Design an enzyme around this catalytic site. Structure first.
Site, short mmCIF file in Angstrom:
data_model
loop_
_atom_site.label_atom_id
_atom_site.label_comp_id
_atom_site.label_asym_id
_atom_site.label_seq_id
_atom_site.Cartn_x
_atom_site.Cartn_y
_atom_site.Cartn_z
N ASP A 267 12.95 10.53 -3.05
CA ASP A 267 13.84 11.47 -2.72
C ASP A 267 13.04 12.86 -3.03
O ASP A 267 12.34 13.14 -3.74
CB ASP A 267 15.26 11.23 -3.27
CG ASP A 267 16.08 9.95 -2.99
OD1 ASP A 267 16.14 9.53 -1.89
OD2 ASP A 267 16.36 9.45 -3.94
N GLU A 268 13.92 13.92 -2.13
CA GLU A 268 13.24 15.11 -2.31
C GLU A 268 13.22 15.44 -3.58
O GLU A 268 14.31 15.26 -4.52
CB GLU A 268 14.52 15.81 -1.55
CG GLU A 268 14.01 17.55 -1.58
CD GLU A 268 14.97 18.35 -0.91
OE1 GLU A 268 15.84 18.86 -1.17
OE2 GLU A 268 14.58 18.99 0.36
C1 LIG Z 1 19.18 12.14 -2.54
C2 LIG Z 1 20.60 11.63 -2.51
O1 LIG Z 1 21.64 12.38 -2.40
N1 LIG Z 1 20.84 10.23 -2.74
C3 LIG Z 1 22.14 9.74 -2.61
C4 LIG Z 1 22.41 8.57 -3.38
O2 LIG Z 1 21.94 8.95 -4.73
C5 LIG Z 1 21.49 7.57 -5.64
O3 LIG Z 1 22.77 7.66 -6.78
C6 LIG Z 1 22.65 6.53 -7.61
C7 LIG Z 1 23.82 6.90 -8.46
O4 LIG Z 1 24.95 6.34 -7.70
C8 LIG Z 1 21.32 6.81 -8.46
O5 LIG Z 1 21.40 8.00 -9.16
C9 LIG Z 1 20.23 6.77 -7.35
O6 LIG Z 1 18.80 6.94 -8.17
C10 LIG Z 1 20.36 7.78 -6.41
O7 LIG Z 1 19.15 7.68 -5.59
C11 LIG Z 1 23.84 8.07 -3.75
O8 LIG Z 1 24.35 9.07 -4.20
C12 LIG Z 1 24.17 8.16 -2.19
C13 LIG Z 1 25.62 7.58 -2.17
O9 LIG Z 1 26.63 8.78 -2.16
O10 LIG Z 1 24.15 9.12 -1.26
C14 LIG Z 1 22.62 9.43 -1.17
O11 LIG Z 1 21.67 8.24 -0.72
#
Ligand SMILES: CC(=O)N[C@@H]1[C@@H](O[C@@H]2O[C@H](CO)[C@H](O)[C@H](O)[C@H]2O)[C@@H](O)[C@@H](CO)O[C@@H]1O
Length: 602
Positions: A267-268
């Site tokens: 991710d970013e």
């Molecule tokens: C970059 C971003 O906002 N991704 C969001 C997701 O993030 C994931 O969160 C889980 C914990 O729930 C974990 O930390 C992962 O590593 C992370 O990628 C997640 O929050 C979803 C659902 O709200 O939204 C985005 O994809």
């Protein structure tokens, strides 16, 4: 009329008449020998839940279900497709073990009601090669029993890919091994399930951010700003130790998952306004990639180095899309990296642009999410809109592309104490059929969502889905004992195992497969509220259990009764740790072991 099966067959040439399954029916394997197809066929006999059995030593004849593996059909049926003919025998022909397996999934639905099926034929080949559910089993732990049920249902609907973000309990880096985690034996059980049910696992360790589940006890690996302040979830990709640490964990994880793909997340890294706080990033970008390079070039290079690393071990890399925003003008992303697209906006690269790079692109839209305590995909509106994988966040393709791999729904635990895994299991029922249908790609089953839901609920779960007894105790009042100690309220809202206590508990099953556990004496409910939290959940091993005012919304007051050896263990619904007697003081605490309790009516 086409058979009422899900997902629907790509086509159906109907005839009149019917096939009828009798007790004398054989399941006959008369194509190439394949021990996997054979093992599947023995399980299939049990799934049919009648008296038909695998035959040996004879040719196919009227009445049989014939499973014919013929590799020479690959050009017509592909790796997963099959030909189905229902006459006076049922014949499934496929090029692979997997195609036979999927044919059997259809046969189960055809014969469930009365052992009869309408005659006709179909060539049934999936439209998309990746047909997925993704589960982020992070921070919290999601039981292996839940995963087994999911995989059986996935297979029953011909879904073939299970993304899992999870932490392997690490021997490479024991300082990362704080709860939640999966032991290596537990991971191997997931691997075995996926092999059984023709699912491909796709593991992820998110990087180079979102690493707080790894870096908590590694302040030396955390990125530091201009003033020395740590960003705890982030590696510093300008330093050689970042890649070294990350690939060491990948290598350990690949040894247990043994998957073809590795997902590194990506991710970013941070918002653009943050790069000036970490001037080492721009410095390293310029140092390596020239005067015009930007931190995004450094980020993309990090990805490409992980790519090289995992390719050296015969694997392929996958990432999320949201760090690809057109700012890496020097370092392009290697084109053999699969991009899973979930987010649009700003300068985030569009699906059309990704697909034009010739790389694989999966549709993992935000709009297909389930989030604990948050967003729930609008299954009905998606169905009504005739959603397909061409419908990405921010962009609808009007032309297909062979490098569009397919699509997945994604299950996230963001507010991890806001919903139990059993609640999520209920919630995902229709999402799962929705994505199965959209990715297999046959004709829409019903003009109405009501018709689709009715059919899906009539078909129900895969055969043998249930793998636990969720209500092994009659609701009532019990003493819960270990030797002569009984669970009882002790000092300061505490709970202990107390010698010769007369204390008792009202146990009452909940709607979602758990029990509340309420003190007869105090009226308060057994809870987990003490210790370190992650995502709002009490995940500290060794934390004390306690008593709190009973609340229907407190999911931490829900307990799973795990049974065994004439006794039970109490597993907290949310933390997935078990009530355990602490040796020093007799306190009830939560651990990854357990104290066995005898339930005595009282
Ligand atoms: C970059 C971003 O906002 N991704 C969001 C997701 O993030 C994931 O969160 C889980 C914990 O729930 C974990 O930390 C992962 O590593 C992370 O990628 C997640 O929050 C979803 C659902 O709200 O939204 C985005 O994809």
């Amino acid at each position: 009329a086409p058979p009422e099966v899900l997902p629907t067959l790509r086509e159906w040439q109907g005839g009149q008449g019917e096939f009828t399954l009798t007790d004398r029916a054989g399941i006959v394997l008369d194509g190439v020998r394949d021990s996997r197809t054979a093992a599947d066929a023995r399980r299939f006999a049990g799934e049919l839940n009648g008296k038909a059995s695998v035959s040996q030593g004879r040719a196919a004849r009227p009445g049989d279900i014939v499973l014919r593996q013929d590799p020479a059909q690959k050009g017509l049926l592909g790796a997963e497709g099959y030909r189905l003919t229902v006459g006076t025998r049922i014949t499934v022909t496929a090029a692979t073990s997997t195609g036979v397996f999927y044919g059997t999934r259809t046969v189960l639905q055809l014969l469930n009601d009365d052992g009869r099926a309408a005659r006709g034929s179909a060539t049934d080949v999936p439209a998309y090669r990746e047909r997925g559910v993704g589960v982020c089993a992070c921070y919290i732990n999601i039981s292996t029993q839940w995963f087994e049920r999911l995989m059986k249902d996935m297979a029953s609907q011909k879904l073939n890919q299970l993304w899992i973000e999870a932490k392997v309990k690490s021997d490479t880096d024991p300082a990362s091994a704080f709860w939640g985690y999966y032991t290596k034996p537990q991971v191997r059980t997931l691997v075995a399930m996926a092999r059984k049910y023709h699912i491909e696992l796709v593991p992820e360790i998110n990087s180079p951010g979102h690493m707080d589940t790894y870096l908590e006890n590694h302040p030396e690996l955390q990125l530091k700003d201009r003033d020395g302040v740590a960003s705890p979830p982030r590696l510093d990709i300008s330093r050689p130790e970042a890649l070294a640490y990350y690939t060491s964990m990948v290598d350990e994880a690949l040894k247990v998952w043994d998957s073809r793909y590795w997902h590194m997340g990506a991710d970013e890294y941070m918002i653009g306004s943050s790069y000036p706080d970490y001037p080492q990033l721009q410095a390293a970008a310029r140092a390596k990639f020239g005067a015009s390079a930007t931190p995004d070039d450094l980020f993309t290079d990090f990805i490409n180095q992980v790519n090289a690393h995992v390719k050296a071990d015969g694997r392929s890399l996958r990432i999320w899309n949201d760090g690809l925003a057109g700012k890496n003008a020097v370092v392009p992303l290697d084109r053999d990296i699969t991009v899973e697209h979930w987010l649009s906006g700003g300068s985030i690269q569009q699906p059309s642009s990704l697909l034009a790079e010739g790389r694989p692109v999966m549709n993992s839209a935000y709009s297909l999410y389930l989030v604990r305590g948050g967003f729930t995909m609008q299954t009905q509106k998606l169905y009504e809109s005739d959603w397909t994988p061409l419908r990405f966040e921010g962009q609808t393709l009007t032309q297909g592309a062979a490098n569009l791999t397919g699509a997945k729904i994604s299950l996230w635990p963001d507010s991890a104490a806001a919903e139990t895994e059993n609640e999520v299991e209920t919630k995902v029922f229709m999402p799962l059929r929705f994505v199965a249908q959209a990715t297999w790609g046959g004709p829409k089953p019903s003009p109405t969502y009501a018709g689709f839901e009715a059919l899906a609920r009539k078909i129900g779960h895969a055969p043998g889905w249930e793998n636990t007894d969720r209500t092994p105790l009659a609701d009532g009042t019990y003493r819960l004992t270990t030797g002569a100690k009984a669970l009882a309220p002790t000092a300061d809202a505490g709970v202990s195992l107390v010698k010769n206590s007369a204390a008792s508990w009202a146990l009452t099953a909940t709607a979602d497969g758990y029990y509340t556990v309420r003190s007869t004496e105090s009226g308060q409910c057994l809870d987990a509220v003490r210790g370190k939290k992650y995502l709002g959940a009490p995940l500290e091993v060794g934390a004390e259990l306690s008593l709190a005012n009973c609340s229907t919304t407190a999911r931490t007051q829900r307990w799973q009764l795990d049974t065994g050896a004439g006794a039970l263990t109490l597993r907290n619904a949310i933390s997935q740790l078990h009530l355990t007697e602490r040796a020093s003081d007799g306190a009830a605490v939560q651990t990854t072991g357990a104290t066995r309790l005898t339930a005595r009516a009282a």
